[PDB]
Each structure stands twice: as C-alpha cells, then as structure tokens.
C-alpha cells in the first residue's frame, strides 16, 4: 500500500564505480499497478 521512490544525482554507457541511493518519497496510495511510461520535453 505504499509507493516508494529512491533517487541519486551524480556528475560524470553506465559507468563504473559505486554509489548508494537514498530514499526520497513514500506515498500512501495503495493502488494496483502493472505498467508505466515516461515523458519528454519536445
């Protein structure tokens, strides 16, 4: 019943190295989920 988003921002294919991701938001939504899509800024 919770939707969790973790994130990390970095300066620089995907490179080498290690970096952990910190929690950003927990949302009390509780909706069934099956599929997703992205957006662009044309």
């Amino acid at each position: 019943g919770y939707f969790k988003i973790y994130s990390k921002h970095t300066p620089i294919d995907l490179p080498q190295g290690f970096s952990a991701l910190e929690p950003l938001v927990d949302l009390p939504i509780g909706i069934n989920i099956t599929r997703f899509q992205t957006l662009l800024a044309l």
Binding site: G1, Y2, P28, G30
Partner: protein, 49 residues
C-alpha cells in the same frame, strides 16, 4: 391538473418561532478502506529528561 413544482422556497423571516428558524446541519461520516488510513488524530508529547 394535479401537477405542481416539487420545490418550494424556505421563506424565512425573523418573526418565525424557535421551531421554524433555520438550522445548519453538518454530517461527518468516517470511511475505513484498504488504505494506510492517513487521517488519525492528535498525539500528545511531554518534555524529555
């Protein structure tokens, strides 16, 4: 012929008696579902030692 408007106005006046004067009514209904139940109620606190 046996046909009238179902809605008629209040027509309130100050002279009306206690039983006829307007009264505002608010109904609060609580619904608990399969959700994390956001609205809970205030929690107190005390000074720390």
């Amino acid at each position: 012929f046996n046909c009238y408007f179902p809605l008629r106005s209040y027509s309130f006046r100050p002279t009306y008696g206690v039983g006829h004067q307007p009264y505002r009514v608010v109904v609060l209904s609580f619904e608990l579902l399969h959700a994390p139940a956001t609205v809970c109620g205030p929690k107190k606190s005390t000074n720390l030692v």
